[PDB]
Amino acid sequence: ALIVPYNLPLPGGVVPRMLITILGTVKPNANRIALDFQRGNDVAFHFNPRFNENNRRVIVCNTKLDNNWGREERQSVFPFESGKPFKIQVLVEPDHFKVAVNDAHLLQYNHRVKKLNEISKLGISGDIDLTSASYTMI
Ligand SMILES: [Cl-]
C-alpha cells in the first residue's frame, strides 16, 4: 500500500543500534528488489535481490560513489520467494550493516561510507507491494 519507489528519510543519518524494518510482499514473477541507503547521490549500501540473473537467484550488495559502482558482494542464500510476504530488518552495527530476513540472519556488509550520520535516506524499490517502512533504536 505504500507507493514504490518509496523514500524513507533517516533524520541525521544512521547510527549503531538503529534498526530499520521493511514489511512487504514480493509480487508474482518478481525480477528484483532494491534497498538503497543514500548519502546524497552516493549509495552507501545497495541491497539487491535478483530473481533471475542467468537463471539463478542471488543477492548483490554494493556501494556507489561519484556515480561509480564498486566491488560487489554476492551471496548464495536467498530467502525471498515470489508471491510471499517478507520482513527485512537492517541493523546498523559499529562496523557493518546486519541484514536479517524473516527473522533469520542473512548477511553483513562492512561500512565503506563512514559518515554514517550523512546516510539520510533509504530508497525502497522493485517488484514488491510495500506495507511499511520504519526504524527504531534498540
Ligand atoms: Cl564517507
Q: Which amino acid is at 67?
A: N
CA of 119 to the centre of ligand 1 (A): 9
Residue partners of 106: CB distance under 8 A and separation at least 6: 59, 75, 77, 79, 99, 100
Q: Is 71 labelled a binding residue?
A: yes
Residue partners of 95: CB distance under 8 A and separation at least 6: 110, 111
Give the domain 1-138 fold.
Jelly Rolls (2.60.120)
Q: Is 74 labelled a binding residue?
A: yes
Q: Domain limits of the chain? A: 1-138
Bridge-based pairing state of the strands 73-75 and 85-92: unpaired
Give the separation between CA 93 and CA 111, rounded to whole angstroms.
Answer: 9
- In angstroms and rounded to an integer, the radius of gyration of the C-alpha atoms of the chain is 14
CA of 121 to the centre of ligand 1 (A): 15
Q: How many CA atoms lie within 13 A of 29 on its CB side?
A: 0
Resolution (A): 1.2
The closest alpha carbon to 46, from 58, 56, 59, 57, belongs to: 59
